[PDB]
Design a protein around this nucleic acid. Sequence first.
DNA 1: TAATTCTGTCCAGA
DNA 2: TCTGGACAGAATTACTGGT
DNA 3: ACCAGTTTTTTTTTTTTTT
Lengths: 657, 1129
Amino acid sequence: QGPLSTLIEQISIDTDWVDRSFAIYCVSYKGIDFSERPKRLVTLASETYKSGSVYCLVKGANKEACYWVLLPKDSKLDLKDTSLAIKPSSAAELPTWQLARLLIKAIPKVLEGLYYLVKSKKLPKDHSGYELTTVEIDLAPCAALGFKQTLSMGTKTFSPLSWQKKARFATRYQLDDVGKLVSKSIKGDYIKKPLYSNAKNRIQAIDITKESYSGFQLSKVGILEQFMQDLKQAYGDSVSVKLQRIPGEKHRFVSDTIVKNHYVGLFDALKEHRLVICDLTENQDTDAALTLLHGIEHLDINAEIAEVPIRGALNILIVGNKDTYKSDEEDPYQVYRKKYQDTVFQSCYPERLWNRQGQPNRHVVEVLLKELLIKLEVHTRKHLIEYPSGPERCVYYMPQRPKDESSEVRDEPWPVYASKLVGDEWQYTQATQEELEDIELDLGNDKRHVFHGFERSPVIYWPETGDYAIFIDTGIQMLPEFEAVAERLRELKEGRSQDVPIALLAQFIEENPESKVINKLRAILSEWDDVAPLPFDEFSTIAYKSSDEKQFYDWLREQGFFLKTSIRGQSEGFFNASLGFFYNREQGMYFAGGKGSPQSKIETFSHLYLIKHSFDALPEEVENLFDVYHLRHRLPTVTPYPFKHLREYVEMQRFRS
Amino acid sequence: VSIEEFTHFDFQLVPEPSPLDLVITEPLKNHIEVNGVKSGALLPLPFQTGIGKTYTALNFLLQQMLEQVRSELKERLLYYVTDSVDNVVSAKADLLKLIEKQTVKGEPRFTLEQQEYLKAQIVHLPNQSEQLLQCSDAVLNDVLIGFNLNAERDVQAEWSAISGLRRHASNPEVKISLNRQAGYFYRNLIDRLQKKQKGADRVLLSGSLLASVETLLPGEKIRNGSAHVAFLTTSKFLKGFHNTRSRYSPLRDLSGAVLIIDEIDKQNQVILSELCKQQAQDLIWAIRTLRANFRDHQLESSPRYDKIEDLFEPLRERLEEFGTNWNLAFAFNTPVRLFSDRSFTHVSSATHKLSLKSDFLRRKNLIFSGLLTRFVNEADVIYQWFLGTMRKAVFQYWENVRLEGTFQEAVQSLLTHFNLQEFESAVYESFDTRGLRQSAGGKANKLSSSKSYHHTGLKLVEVAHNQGTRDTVNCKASFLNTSPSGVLADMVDAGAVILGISATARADTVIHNFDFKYLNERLGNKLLSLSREQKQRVNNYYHSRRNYKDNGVVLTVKYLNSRDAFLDALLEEYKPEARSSHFILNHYLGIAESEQAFVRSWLSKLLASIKAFISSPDNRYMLSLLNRTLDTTRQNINDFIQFCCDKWAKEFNVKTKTFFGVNADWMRLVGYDEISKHLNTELGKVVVFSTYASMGAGKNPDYAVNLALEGESLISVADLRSDIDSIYLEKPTQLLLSDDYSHTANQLCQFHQILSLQENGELSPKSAENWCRQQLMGMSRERSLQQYHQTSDYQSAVRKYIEQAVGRAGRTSLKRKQILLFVDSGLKEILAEESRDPSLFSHEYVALVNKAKDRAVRRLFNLAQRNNKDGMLSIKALVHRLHNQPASKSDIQEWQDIRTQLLRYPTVAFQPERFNRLYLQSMTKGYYRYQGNLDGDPNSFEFFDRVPYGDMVSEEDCSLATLVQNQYVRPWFERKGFACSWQKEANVMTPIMFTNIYKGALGEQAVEAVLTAFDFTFEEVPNSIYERFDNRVIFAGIEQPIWLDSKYWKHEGYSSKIALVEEEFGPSKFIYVNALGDTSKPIRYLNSCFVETSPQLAKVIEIPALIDDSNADTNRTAVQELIKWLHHS
DNA sequence: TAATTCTGTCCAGA
DNA sequence: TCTGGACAGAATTACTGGT
DNA sequence: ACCAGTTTTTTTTTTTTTT
Ligand SMILES: [Mg+2]
């Protein structure tokens, strides 16, 4: 059926059951001007919540400025303000997903929305309470896929009200005594705000660190499973949401071998060029340059340190942090960029060269080298390593954001740059106004993606046919097979709860004397009480890796002690939705994940990307644009490499303006 | 109450000595027979606590008191020192009880009069605040009236306020304020009393006034001979105590004193804390003041100051020289951190070597990227030199006047005479500890002396812009001059007899105990030890007192791993209406994610121990030793632990009571007696949660037995109280010492620990220097602990802690038939490495080690590297100095001493006292292999098996055998005592000494012998050109100077040397000669360059080989050619 | 001025 | 009081052994 | 080579005296 995603395949709601269980009303201001209705929506909802027993309310179509209100079956909406139009409504009148959102908002009371507490942090001294980290569950339309619905699992934090006037006047949320849920209250001494805008609280997408089900329950996906359980608990079969599976056509995996070969190919190309290191900081910590050189040394690349940039060489300019400068005049980086206008060089802050532990950071060095190689390829306008063939006769374009930060930049025309492959050389130019007008006309309804908003995306264009291709982040998240993983983790949890009698271990030693696990089991038993059954924690040193160890653990499973098992094998395929590069030509969706085996703790969901195009069938060469493991450092990318090169070119031209 | 009461006393009548008494006494008799009286000694006594250790110590003390009484009738200060005040008080009370209650053959040993006399000879010396608050208002009024000081309104008002407060100061805050006020008042009052007694108005003390003063000042009883036994803490012992005349420092007067130290190993940390407190001094200001004031004040022609000015004359000379060379008159201007152990370790925070330049027009000295390190190093040496001279001057001032009141008088008089009052404090705190230095001539930081960190210390200098005037910088320097081991060795060298009474007194850790390797090397026979027979006697006594096996007591040891599923089930039962154990731990137990894994492990181990304990039917009293207090700050975990304890008590049907906040403060306020009361009166089990620190020495966990509640589990294990029968031992943590007195004190503590590990051989010089660098830049506590964990010293300290805990838990003779020891599995590997002799291990520790079931080899490599590095850097510095004129007088002697030592003793049987850094322990007896660039990094050297194919240091590689066989050189060597062959001993000269010194010295001596056989003669090179040429050759018939240089393979600077020699001494002839080689190659002549020329146009003659190495024939033809060339002029 | 990709606050707007 | 869209912040750029 | 379990520094409480 294919990998799972948060995109909703179907929502099943028994409208008759809802009508038998709840009452629904439609609300909108009566007679008030559309310019003033916003000024009184500030109170409308609060007045509705002050009216009586209102479960929840949901905004409708923006053009209507109306609300759908949910109340118990026997209750009736009564607003003292006569300037409001009110109308009893049946559940069948609402959009299915809007009614689903209303029902979701009502789960906390049936048992602003639904929040699951996942993690709490005690406040510093002189304060009391917790900073609550929760996973919010809510539906949201998918603008990229014709207003299909997605199930969001965003993290959102709560803090005590005690910890400005706006903060004081916010929904005074409250945490449950059980601590399972967080819900709005009048005097609940909680606000939905963290300490800073910094230090953003995050919740793991998946967590199977030690195949621990309890730790799995505290990830976003574990909360999703718990929400699916709570939905049935609250409404049984009357309400259900089915997540859609993306049809699978091609799913390339990425082993460490492929990436390593790609990167040895990459580093070899840089060994043929000269590299220089500079430092323009005031209090010159030359140890930064020494560390950079030593990191480059481990990659066998001829590098040297110079006090000034050298034209024609690959220079790395260690520069002071911009935040310490109030204007561009104080920045040495821009000052030297304005001067050295025709040379490839890269910059980085000194502090980035070491990790939190203080050890040198080699990812920084490798990313610097790869960026230098990409910039050199742009400068020479030729590839220095093998890039798979892209579509023929195509032209790439990339709008560039002006420096103005005013809101009117949203609609302003932008400078547009283009690149093209002729023979072996890459041609880079700024798109002429006639070309941009033709492109805008050809894109039709999709022009808004390239010429409107701050989110202006690059486009592949075919002048000889007018065809185009835009690569859009849909916002849909790809999920592993979390139901099956949860079942396996629960099975392991039940099995590991029972201590193994020594009799079974003695029997295994007797039955398989050739097994080499016995060398370990005899030692373990000798270091244990002959009367007490062994808890699973004693076998932890016996990894489920060798054939004999696998046989031993399988034999224990037959005895009823399910302790260890294979979870991330390709045969199972649980974590396919977060590995390698997945692409579907017919429907033009793709996503990228990790390489090799899934790490036990995955902190993010790979988004599903939608290629919007005019072809009857997308050209095959488009797939080739993603087989590049250095655009995204040592990982499969979701951006075509021509766009990476064009972005680098556009960045270079900034100081030539 | 007088000495006459003992006239009829039988001093030969004594209680039947126990084996411990004999073990204490007979080593001292042997020491007196070997080292003689008034020698001083250190006698560690690994007595297990609980088994008569305190009684034996106090009995020995009482026997010494009786010996003093006997000597007084026929015709010495006794100290009992321990870290804790309550321990001191308990020891004094126990001594009084022993005096009152001792019986011999059924009758009281001492009559009431004798008892009173003996109890009057014992003194307790608490801190000044407690000393004042212990005095009754009558005593203070009597003292004030007797000294007519009550007429002073300030003193009277303050005393009235103190008296008023003392009557109702029950509130802890009011009590603290009262303590501070009492301390300050005591300080002021004693200052006034001492001032009054110093002057011509000295008050005669007698009758009630004398008794009142003695009650106020027990040091007065010590001074006037009324008492000679003092009970005081180590802090008070180091600080000294006041008498009516001045403050008395025991350290300065240890000749003949007996010093009983309880918990000897613990005193290392106390002494280190005391040492690390000394203030940071601005070196620039110090040297400027010294030079200016030495210029200002010159002399005084009085008898008192005879032999004083000559002590400072060298200091005057060097102060003027240093001021001129570095232009100290100029202001210093451009934080920078410099660290140095004064010997082979020199770390700086700056990435670029900072240098000092002088601008005369600016009238400033500029620090920019003369090295800065050299400036501070020279200034520090002068500053220490000045303080050392004061110590000598003060001593001489006494001999002129003829050591406590006169000592301060001498310090004040000398400082006033030289106008250096600003250094009076520095001098006092220098003399208190460093002034006890007996190894003054034992180490001048010279290679010819006995070099060690423990009597060298370390220096730490901060360079920063001066506050209030940023145009200048100040070099604030803090330093140690000795380590706690150095202080102990100096105490023993001063004549003190020290009884170190502590189980694990020889723990084999330099961080948590004195460096006993250094103490052995430093003391020799003075470091006493128990023979195998004495240790066997002690073991037999302990077994008789703790006969476990014969009485059927079973020690059940259980090592526990982290139990995640068990803890998960417990957490899920606690708050059953929850979902995730991780959430329960995070939300309800309040544990952050960064510590969740660690908390899970240690909490699970603790709860498994508690479950096993409650499951057992008979055991009643469990003690849990964690590294953290489960007090109110962790109440959330205490609630869960209480839930688990209640669950298991209900499951196994036995009442259990938990004591969570068992803590030093809880022990003071609530008292440990509550647990004993509960055990004595309440049926069921008891679980006590404490820590290794909380259960320190002196805390007695016993409880009174009530046989109705004990069932039949108790068995008397001796040939009514019982103790802990179950224990959980968490792995000791935070094993690196730290000081919180100040930031600089903590830095000194950390650097002392690092340098102590390097000195002991636990760290290679590379690792030690890297750790010092990381510490200087400000490494984290956790990284310091990671560095420490790599050493075996860490494992030794952990084993010491575990042994101390288990020993302290075993203080009775009533044992339960089963004793449960639960141990964190992290201790299994550490305890499995225990390999010391188990003769003195406690039964619990023996069981721990058996259930688990510092390599000299590692130390040999590290010490070889350390000695080679020290030799390399010391020789480099010495040669550089020899290439400077003024310092030639002493450096020449040092150079000659080193060369003579190496020639005379290429290899030695025993670790030398002096020249100890010239050798390394070869591990191969008389030879060894090594690799390393002698001109490169000294940290890169490797030795012995690590380099089988490396260069070799042996008698063969220097060709001594082919040199001294059939030649004139053998009579030379035999006459001068040089070694004709290498004795195959363990200690061999380091690679640097072998290559850079010994092999050149052999050539020099051989050349001198061979040429003197042909009527030549030599004189020492003048200091101006010393060490640039071997010797100056004198021969009949030639008036021109002749210079000789015996160095192989140019070991272009030769032309510069020739020019420098000639420009001063005029035209001269030079001889270049290799002692060994082959005659096959012709003699050559040269003219101030490597290009040769005709004989008569040449001033340099090269003899390629004076001696044929094939058979050791003398190349007489070369000698004749040399003579002819000399005579030709 | 590490880069890419995903995402948590946050704020105006309908 | 809803809600979705920008806009900076945070994590990830593995490891190692068995086959 | 490849594929899937393993995995990651260390983890405080305590003391005396003189100012
Ligand atoms: Mg860039």
